[PDB]
Each structure stands twice: as C-alpha cells, then as structure tokens.
Design a protein around this ligand. Structure first.
Ligand SMILES: Cc1nnc(-c2ccc(C)c(-c3ccc(C(=O)NCC4CC4)cc3)c2)o1
Length: 345
C-alpha cells in the first residue's frame, strides 16, 4: 500500500517524502541530503534525493548503478538501504528517486581532526574498515574512493563505509584530500586497476589515525608521487614491466632510484604490529599488497578478529555495466528496483 507524501522546500528544490519522515534538515557535500527522524523505526536517517536522475544516458545509468549497489550492501560496516521511494504513481510520471540510509553522527575526518586516537581506537576503526571491505570486495565491487570523509562513525566508534566511487580533473588538482588517499596506479593511470587500490587507501588512513597527519599530502600528482616513492622506494624492474602505459613507465624511469624507508623511523613510537601491517598495505606493486581478508587475520587485530563474524557478500551481478541501453530502458530498470524494494528487519 502507498503511504501519504507531504512536501516542503529545502533549499531551491521541493522534497516530497512519506509522512513517516519528519524534521528534515539539510546536512551539500554528499549530494542532496537531509537528516530526518524516521518515526516507524525510531532511527535518525539520511535521505538523499537524486539529482535529475534520467536527464542523460550516463545519468540514468548512474542512478541505476547507485540503486543496485545500495540494495545489495547488507553488512554492519557498509552503508545500506533502509528505504527507497518515489512519489510517482506509475512509470510514466517516475522522475525522482529518494534513498534512505542510517545517519551516523560524524565522519572519520572529524574524528582524526578533533580527538586524540589511542592505538586501540586505531585497531577498532581499521578493523571495521577491513571487515566491510572484505565484504565489498567479495562481491567484486571496488570502492575506489576511500578517504576519511566517507567513513561514517557513531558515538561508540562504530563505522560504516559510504560513497562508493561511482571525479573531474579539477577536483583532483592541487593540494586536495580528493587525491591524497589514491593508489599511485589510479592517480597516474599506470595500468588496469583492481580492488587492492582500496587497500592502499586504508594504509593512508591508518597512518593518519596513528600520527594525526596526512601521509602523502601532495601539492599535485607529481609531488604526491614523490612523497609516495620517498617512503616506499622507486619501482623495481618487475613493476615497471606491469605498467601498461608506455608514457607513465617512461616518466617513472627518469627518477633517481630510492630505497624503501624504515617504517619504524617514520611511525616513531607506534605499535610494531601497526608498523608491520602498514608495510604490507603500502606496497607499490598492487599484486603484492595484503588483501582485506588476509589483513583481518593479522596479529594487530587479535583483539577484534572473529573468523565466524566476518561475512562475505551474496553474488553481485553487474553485467549491466557492459550494457548500452536507452534512457527509458535504464529508467524502467531503476523503477523495477524501486518497486521491488523490501525493507530490512
Ligand atoms: C552508492 C552510495 N554510496 N553512498 C551512498 C549513499 C546514498 C544515500 C545517502 C543518504 C548516503 C549517505 C551519505 C552520508 C551519510 C553520513 O552519515 N554522513 C556523515 C557526515 C555528516 C557527518 C549517510 C548516508 C550515501 O550511496
């Protein structure tokens, strides 16, 4: 049965949401999002209204991608879908999509920036990121854009992963957090990349939680690459060969060879086990980085690691990515996914 919708204007656009959602207030950065009190579940929720979802093929495909991703993610440490609705009564008038998720009070960026983090806080926070990433990667999904701002956290330090990378050139330019957590292979388009790019991001985050400082705050791509290589050393012959970009390979070979630095001398006073894990994450060769599944079993997480409570994901069919469809087809697929949504228990 259809709920009653009511409307209000929240900064230049009309929100039409079901009555269960009250006290809407904008929170901007994450898209077009409102905090809301959900009266049926008693939860504080985030309601995102999609922005012109079917105005182009790329937009319509994006909207479907986003809904597909969110409907599949059911894990404590990954943002999931509480609800999805449109005020539209049929396909013909279907033109707006609204998404409802948990609203966690803060992001990791405000945590590291405002509070001192004990080594035990670091254990728990990274543990949770890895636990959710094992789940994410097990579905063959790559986040691609892991940074402190898309790690939501509550009062109890419980964490969910948000905003799967699904950026323009300018946004990646200069002295910007948008690029500081990016694996060098994506940053510079070295090769066809995979899910361990997400592990490099975790390395940078973990480092920053331990020291309270960005690990590689490059002023631009090249400066950042230098910051990276000073720490991990320049590529060996084996890696140079795996860079499929001739042009990128040729550039990296112009650099004075440097060895990998001693991580105990960079992360002074840190847990030796934390140092070890960092050395295994911040490996230049992605083939050799530690996987999230492998990381969870590392000694650093002895306290939180529970092999029976680190679930993988159901199969995720993303063959739609290969498909070229018409706006109307992408829109009909999105509609079918809206109409068949069943709330969680
Ligand atoms: C895909 C995908 N990845 N993330 C989303 C998504 C979709 C809808 C929403 C409302 C959100 C969302 C975005 C941010 C938060 C959130 O809790 N941010 C915390 C910052 C304010 C202190 C919660 C949820 C995220 O979708």
């Amino acid at each position: 049965e259809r709920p009653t919708f009511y409307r209000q204007e929240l900064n230049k656009t009309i929100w039409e949401v079901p009555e269960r959602y009250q006290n809407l207030s904008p929170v901007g950065a994450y898209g077009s999002v409102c905090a809301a009190f959900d009266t049926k579940t008693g939860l504080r929720v985030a309601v995102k209204k999609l922005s012109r979802p079917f105005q182009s093929i790329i937009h319509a495909k994006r909207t479907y991608r986003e809904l597909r991703l969110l409907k599949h993610m059911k894990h404590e440490n990954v943002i999931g879908l509480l609800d999805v609705f449109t005020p539209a009564r049929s396909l013909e008038e279907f033109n707006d999509v609204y998404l409802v998720t948990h609203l966690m009070g803060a992001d990791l960026n405000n945590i590291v920036k405002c509070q001192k983090l004990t080594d035990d806080h670091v254990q728990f926070l990274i543990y949770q990121i890895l636990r959710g990433l094992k789940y994410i990667h097990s579905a063959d999904i790559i986040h691609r854009d892991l940074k402190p701002s898309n790690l939501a956290v509550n009062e109890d330090c419980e964490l969910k992963i948000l905003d799967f990378g699904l950026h323009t050139d300018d946004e990646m330019t200069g002295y910007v957090a948008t690029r500081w957590y990016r694996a060098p292979e994506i940053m510079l388009n070295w090769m066809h990349y995979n899910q361990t790019v997400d592990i490099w991001s975790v390395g940078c985050i973990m480092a920053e939680l331990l020291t309270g400082r960005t690990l590689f705050p490059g002023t631009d791509h090249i400066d950042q690459l230098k910051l990276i290589l000073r720490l991990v050393g320049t590529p060996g012959a084996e890696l140079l060969k795996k860079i499929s970009s001739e042009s990128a390979r040729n550039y990296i070979q112009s650099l004075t060879q440097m060895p990998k630095m001693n991580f105990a001398n960079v992360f002074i006073g840190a847990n030796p086990l934390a140092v070890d894990l960092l050395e295994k994450m911040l490996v230049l060769d992605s083939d050799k980085r530690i996987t999230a599944a492998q990381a969870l079993a590392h000694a650093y997480f002895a306290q939180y690691h529970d092999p029976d409570d680190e679930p993988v994901a159901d199969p995720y069919d993303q063959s739609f990515e290969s498909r070229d469809l018409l706006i109307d087809e992408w829109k009909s697929l999105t509609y079918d996914e809206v109409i068949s949504f069943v709330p969680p228990p």
